[PDB]
Amino acid sequence: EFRPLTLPPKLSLSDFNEFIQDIIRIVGSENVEVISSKDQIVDGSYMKPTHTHDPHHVMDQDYFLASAIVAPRNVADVQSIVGLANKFSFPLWPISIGRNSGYGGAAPRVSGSVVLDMGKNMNRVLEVNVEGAYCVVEPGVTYHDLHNYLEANNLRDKLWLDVPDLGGGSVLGNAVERGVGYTPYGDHWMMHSGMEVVLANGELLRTGMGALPDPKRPETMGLKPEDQPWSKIAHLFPYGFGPYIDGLFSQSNMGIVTKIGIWLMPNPRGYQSYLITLPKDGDLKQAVDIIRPLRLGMALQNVPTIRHILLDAAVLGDKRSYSSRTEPLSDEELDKIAKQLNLGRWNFYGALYGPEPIRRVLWETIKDAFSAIPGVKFYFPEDTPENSVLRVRDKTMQGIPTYDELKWIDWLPNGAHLFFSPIAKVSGEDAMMQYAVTKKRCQEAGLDFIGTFTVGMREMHHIVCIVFNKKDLIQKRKVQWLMRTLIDDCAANGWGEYRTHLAFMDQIMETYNWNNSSFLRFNEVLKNAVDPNGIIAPGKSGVWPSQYSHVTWKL
Amino acid sequence: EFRPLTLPPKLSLSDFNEFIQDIIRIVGSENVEVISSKDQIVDGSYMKPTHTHDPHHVMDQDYFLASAIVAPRNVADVQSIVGLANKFSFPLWPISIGRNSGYGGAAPRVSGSVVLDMGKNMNRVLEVNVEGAYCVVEPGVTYHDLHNYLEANNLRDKLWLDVPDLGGGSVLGNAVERGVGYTPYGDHWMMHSGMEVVLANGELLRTGMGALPDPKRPETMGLKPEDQPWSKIAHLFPYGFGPYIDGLFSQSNMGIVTKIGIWLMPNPRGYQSYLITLPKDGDLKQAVDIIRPLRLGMALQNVPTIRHILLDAAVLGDKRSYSSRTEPLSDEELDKIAKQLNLGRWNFYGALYGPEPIRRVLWETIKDAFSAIPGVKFYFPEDTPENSVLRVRDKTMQGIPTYDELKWIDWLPNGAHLFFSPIAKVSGEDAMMQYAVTKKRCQEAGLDFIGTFTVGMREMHHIVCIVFNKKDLIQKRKVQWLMRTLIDDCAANGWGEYRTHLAFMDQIMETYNWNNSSFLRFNEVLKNAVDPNGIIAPGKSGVWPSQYSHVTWKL
Amino acid sequence: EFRPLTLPPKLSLSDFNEFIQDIIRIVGSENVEVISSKDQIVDGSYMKPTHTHDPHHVMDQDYFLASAIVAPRNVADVQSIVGLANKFSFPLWPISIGRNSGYGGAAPRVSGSVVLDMGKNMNRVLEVNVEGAYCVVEPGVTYHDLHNYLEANNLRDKLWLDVPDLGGGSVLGNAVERGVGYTPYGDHWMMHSGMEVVLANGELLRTGMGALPDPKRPETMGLKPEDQPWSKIAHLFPYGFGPYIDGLFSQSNMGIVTKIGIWLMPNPRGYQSYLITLPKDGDLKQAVDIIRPLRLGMALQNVPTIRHILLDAAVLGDKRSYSSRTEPLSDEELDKIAKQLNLGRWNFYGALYGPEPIRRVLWETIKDAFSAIPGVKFYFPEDTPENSVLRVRDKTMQGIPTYDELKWIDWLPNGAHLFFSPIAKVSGEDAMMQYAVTKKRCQEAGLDFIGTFTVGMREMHHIVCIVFNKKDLIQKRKVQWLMRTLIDDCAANGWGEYRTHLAFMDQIMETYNWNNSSFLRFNEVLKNAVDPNGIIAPGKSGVWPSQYSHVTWKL
Ligand SMILES: *Cc1cc2c(cc1C)[n+](Cc1ccc(O)cc1)c1c(=O)[nH]c(=O)nc-1n2C[C@H](O)[C@H](O)[C@H](O)COP(=O)([O-])OP(=O)(O)OC[C@H]1O[C@@H](n2cnc3c(N)ncnc32)[C@H](O)[C@@H]1O
Ligand SMILES: *Cc1cc2c(cc1C)[n+](Cc1ccc(O)cc1)c1c(=O)[nH]c(=O)nc-1n2C[C@H](O)[C@H](O)[C@H](O)COP(=O)([O-])OP(=O)(O)OC[C@H]1O[C@@H](n2cnc3c(N)ncnc32)[C@H](O)[C@@H]1O
Ligand SMILES: *Cc1cc2c(cc1C)[n+](Cc1ccc(O)cc1)c1c(=O)[nH]c(=O)nc-1n2C[C@H](O)[C@H](O)[C@H](O)COP(=O)([O-])OP(=O)(O)OC[C@H]1O[C@@H](n2cnc3c(N)ncnc32)[C@H](O)[C@@H]1O
């Protein structure tokens, strides 16, 4: 409790101690973990994450690190700490889950900060409404939970989730992060309606229609604002009236979110998952010119994703279990692998939704569509092996949370994922053009290119999956080089990343430099006005309170 | 030029004069119209709007009024004036079109303000890209234009708009206002990607991916930031990286928008409009419980709208041309009218989109769906008269801009529309429950209830259409009473309005009072930080720069 | 001493401790009670009140609560603490008595505050002057005391008090609260002349003529300002010269009052109390049209009060001792009760004052007046039973303090009074019109309407007496609902409450919203200027120092 390994800025030890003390004096000694010595070395697991730092560590492991961690027990709690963080100018690092792995996990941008483990005690499914087809959750509600909640309330037969590759993340955190999932409810952020947050001054706020208060009633009298129910329309319409501010709340540091309204997808009455294996590495090109109008025409239902063989392969076994060769794999061993598995070089998964008479037609147009690609082959989970990736993806394209993809995090003995994610047009050319670049460097990096193009409706997210050995300093540096390098090129070409690890937020935000950082600047102004003190997650999205030296702080 | 009828606050005449002078000294005498005497009495037309005030005037006609008007010729212009408005603390009232009729039109919230007729000279279709299925426009681009643009470039066969009941409004303004249209691209605001605005400090900003700058090239050298092209992804992905600020830009006074990226809907390959007449006033109830899961299942394509007989009737002829009776019409004369027209009490229009094999099925489920409603009857524009509303709605549900609905603005000799628009759940009950309230007051008001429920996907917008005689002070007051009254009740019931005339922004913003105006307050803080001086449209969405007395200002 | 259960805002534990320490270091350990654990559960009694909170608790019992309590021993003391409250920004909650029960008692608006038990040691009758017919008192002087003081100085034969229903309250506190009593000296606040208060800066002030200092004299040399006598005219004329500021001192948080000049009523030379029972519930109507011109003509002497049967009945026995029926009593059981007691539905008490030749005439006009009401019946305490309410009221209408009315606080097993008190015109219509509303809700509330119209000379105070069970959370919520509900309606009708419990000060102050809170705003400005720090009773009368989030604070 007395002497963490790292103080936040300008902070005195006594102050830390007092601050930390009052905090124990509220959330309970149970709710706080002070980080006193390096024996923190304990990185974690995906099963039970470390909140102190970056598990997959690229910089010094100990580089981005908490001074201590706090489990607020309830909103009022969050409110009080904000007060203290304000009294002492101790800044906070709020997190729901811990899982922002491949992005930094629980590690705070600024070291010596306070990690606000929000999900610990705030695990509630506040509500699930069928007629509205939505749910309301706390940070702590992981996807699996949100799911089991449905199962145990026999709702599955009426409403469905939308999960990301992994089952464990916070439904809530992922949404503010603007994460991605598979069904037609894939765009997480967009699926929200009505949120709540403890702004910096410690004041509570609820968005959109969340502002229009539920009328009064004998049963609702005297409940803290926090515990008050919401208005009817709160979660069925996100806008409200006048300035639509929710966005200041995603991937920013404008506030601490306590709750959120997530739309649920009504069981559609028909579902069919599949694969369309692509034979040549260059097929990736025509496939896109293909996938393009189908998605826009909505012939393409959920989010199409087109996987690189190894992703699947890695999902399948370690790199070693395929070729004990320190260098990266030859254009040739892939094909060999591509065949060993019955996959392509490129591997397109999707799903059809609803009444079969329409699923049937759609498939015709698609199946019929991808036919111009030679050696193309179509499948249904049944037409494939038991360890089959497509197997998992079927649960996936239907809200069922897996955990199997993690295994690809295993390719290299010390696995640590990291993802580069320039966004590119749905153009086979551009897709190809992008890729070339990406791969080339992975090469240069001593790296196996590994990645996928998830298809947005009018844009495409290229996720370069960089595993790397968390213990080989030589490689990690190679990775940092690679990273920052790719960032530069991408932008050189006009492609921005849309999400990133802690260590690159800056470089990333700077790419977005039109008219002289005009945007960053605007932002700063707003962060200032609202977080006069910088307590809330300074450095996020590379945004810094004036209290922070851009000089001492950026990277 | 010398002596407008109204000065903005704390402004001296000399100052006005100097301010106004320098302004002529840039935009040209052509670009400015000084409002010197009441002979402004000239209200307008929909064909060529008055910018000085509120055409359909509820308060004193002259109540909300410009001191003068200015047509910025180009962005730099807008930038300079901002400077002047800042030099003199003269505030501005930016408008694209002029058409915000039923909301106030060109009338500025604060009188003596400067009306910034943005659309006058900034009429450009900057771009339309087919592969992206989007366009980029200036305030001045009205819908008809955006349309004729397609026609004259033979694009109609590939891309389609999404219009509101009327053809003339600014595509751009309507979007920031969060307006509504008919096709599946009905949600205007949501269809935007990449915008540009002159913030208050006069600095330019482009959102999302608009921040990621187009790489350099010999042909783009030396163009003002304003004239620079955009990045590839600029208009195909709205988010960018870090804080998603676009929303601060809709229905707010955070900035002056110069341009915007609007998604275009690719010609779908099949379209079928229709009507399903509802016989009993109470049918409105079951219809909704009906429409509800179809929209969520997406069986329901574009935005369903369920019209009250009179809307159609009024679209059809004046109230007099149906019953010279100063009082409002009897539950009975309607039915009589409902029959005279072949319509119902309630009248549901929609459209099917794409390949007939799917249109066909959909219609079955729908046609098949509404069958539980007795006396229900289905139609295609062909199955109806030539003056038929459905005729117009077919052009409408397909991006073709009409002008015919205006005629309903004619019901009462001096027609002036005004709309009340509580938002309610897609629940027949609630729908009914809402309505009751609404109508009851229209009664009390000496008013014909006239309205419609446009169906949002998970919420429903009830548009009460209040015509009223712009010259009968007795009635107008009745209307104000009605208004403010309805506002109170609605909220009493938990329904917020989402858009409103100038004269009620306040009352409206106040309904949104959860946790003590927590939201309004937050907003104010942001407006402050960014418009330290209050020049930009103070009072909008009922948000006021501290420079403004809430005491002297609210209503 | 070390760890109260609640800190005031932004306060650190060490600070509390230091603050609390210095305070012990002056007023004595005897004078302070630190609130360390929930074992505070001890609500109290009317005989010896709890200062920590709200005895009759509507919100969480523990909702509004002290951090500790302090008994300043003398003014200098009050002055020093003010200093400390200022040094630490610890705010204060000053109280004389503790009895503000049905309003909150000793509970501070803001929890974690310091309760300033002023009356503990400042119990003095500083003076009673016969020729002036006034007295001067400290907070601690309860009414009984002020009375016994007269008895033991044989003054009763020359001067008389004016008590409220209860004997125990602070004569002083009740006056600043603008309380009410029975004789012609019923308007407490108005009976004051010359007061003294420790303003926020810790500086002492004496009002009106209190400012004109008593000339110097050998015997008065060197006495603290506090102990200095007053000028002659100090207590016989309230105004002084220039701005009449006393009012900033009643029901506000502009200062801590240490003393006050209260006018005494000279024994009048004749007194006769009585009752005029009203038979029908609707008699209440004509009675008022009756009582109206008599009061204005002054035929009506003291404050007439017209009681609802149950008040008397409850004064008489518990509800159970009349009808074991969880629901509220039938219009019928009342009449039955009304008869069981010899009372009416409505029950008008009063008194005649002075020389019999005039009392005699008055009574004629009155007796003669109420004769138009059928079944009307007149009485003198003698014409009634021993447990008779009128018995008590005779002592009452003559300054003699009872304690018997408390028993009505007993109707329901866990008794807790609360009072709603819209003010209405002296119009039988309005009176009736008001009542209807009030009762209707009590209904809805599962509540027995219980109340009375005390007649002001040109306005009438309707005191709805809500008992309710302090342990039944279901009911309490019902009460809050009821409350806030009634508040809304009343105002809907144009009736304001004039006094209220802690938990509604806000809702109440907001009703008073003419011209946009113009008044509240003005007030705030003044509180600001004078209590730059907010230490003095923030939130009172719903007025909050800018140091206080209206967002975090209101209700
Ligand atoms: C390891 C991994 C990650 C991954 C994968 C697959 C694997 C094997 N899939 C594949 C993928 C990856 C990236 C992209 O772009 C697409 C696909 C994912 C997937 O399919 N879709 C995704 O969107 N992400 C995937 N990820 C990444 C990762 O698994 C997810 O992003 C997790 O959901 C993140 O973890 P979680 O524990 O939910 O978040 P947490 O550690 O709590 O941090 C959230 C961040 O947001 C802010 N924040 C969080 N909570 C709050 C609160 N309460 N208030 C305010 N802000 C909050 C913080 O800044 C925090 O840093
Ligand atoms: C008369 C009428 C109106 C109408 C109708 C039908 C009729 C007969 N239909 C039916 C309807 C009405 C309301 C609702 O809610 C639904 C349906 C409409 C329709 O089908 N859908 C609509 O969304 N609106 C309809 N309306 C209302 C009206 O016709 C439209 O809202 C117009 O599009 C508004 O006029 P326009 O000329 O485009 O706007 P303008 O006068 O320029 O003002 C825009 C406001 O927004 C801000 N703003 C505008 N330009 C800028 C710029 N450049 N920068 C910054 N802010 C800007 C301003 O605050 C301005 O006040
Ligand atoms: C329980 C009850 C209450 C009651 C009753 C009858 C019963 C059974 N009678 C009937 C009645 C009730 C309400 C109304 O409107 C009319 C009639 C009362 C009566 O006949 N007349 C009344 O005026 N009130 C009656 N009340 C209510 C209650 O009994 C009285 O209001 C008491 O006199 C209040 O208690 P007391 O102990 O005197 O006050 P205290 O707890 O010290 O608080 C006073 C408040 O004023 C401010 N304040 C107090 N002291 C100071 C000092 N020294 N400086 C500055 N401000 C001070 C504080 O804000 C404090 O909260």
Curated annotation (Swiss-Prot), chains A, B, C:
Q: Where is this site: Important for the catalytic mechanism?
A: D165
- Describe the thermal dependence of activity: Optimum temperature is 38 degrees Celsius.
Stored PROSITE patterns: FAD_PCMH
Query: What does the record give as the reaction this protein catalyses?
Result: 4-hydroxy-3-methoxy-benzenemethanol + O2 = vanillin + H2O2
Keyword set for this entry?
Answer: Cytoplasm, FAD, Flavoprotein, Methanol utilization, Oxidoreductase, Peroxisome
Cofactor binding, per record:
Binds 1 FAD covalently per subunit.
Enzyme Commission identifier(s): 1.1.3.38
Looking at the record, the residues that make up the FAD-binding PCMH-type domain are 62-267
Q: Which residues carry this modification: Tele-8alpha-FAD histidine?
A: H417
Q: What InterPro entries does the entry give?
A: Cytok_DH_C_sf, FAD-bd_oxidored_4_C, FAD-bd_PCMH, FAD-bd_PCMH-like_sf, FAD-bd_PCMH_sub1, FAD-bd_PCMH_sub2, FAD-linked_Oxase-like_C, Oxid_FAD_bind_N
- Major subcellular site: other
Tell me which cofactor or cofactors this protein depends on. Answer: FAD
Active site, UniProt feature:
Y103, Y498, R499
Q: What induces it?
A: By 4-methoxybenzyl alcohols, anisyl and veratryl alcohols. Repressed by carbon catabolite.
Q: Where is this gene product found?
A: Peroxisome; Cytoplasm
Matches recorded under SUPFAM superfamilies: FAD-binding/transporter-associated domain-like, FAD-linked oxidases, C-terminal domain
Asked whether the UniProt record includes Protein transport among its keywords, one would answer no
One Pfam family here: FAD_binding_4
Describe activity versus pH: Optimum pH is about 10.
Query: Which Gene Ontology cellular-component terms appear in the entry?
Result: mitochondrion; peroxisome
Molecular function, one GO term:
D-lactate dehydrogenase activity
Q: Does the keyword Zinc apply?
A: no
Describe its partners and assembly state.
Homooctamer (tetramer of tightly interacting dimers).
Q: What does this protein do?
A: Catalyzes the conversion of vanillin alcohol to vanillin, and also the conversion of a wide range of phenolic compounds bearing side chains of variable size at the para position of the aromatic ring. Crucial for the degradation of the secondary metabolites derived from the degradation of the lignin. Catalyzes besides the oxidation of 4-hydroxybenzyl alcohols, the oxidative deamination of 4-hydroxybenzylamines, the oxidative demethylation of 4-(methoxy-methyl)phenols and the oxidative hydration of 4-allylphenols. Most active with 4-allylphenols.
Q: Which family does it belong to?
A: To bacterial flavocytochrome p-cresol methyl hydroxylase.
**Protein name per UniProt:** Vanillyl-alcohol oxidase
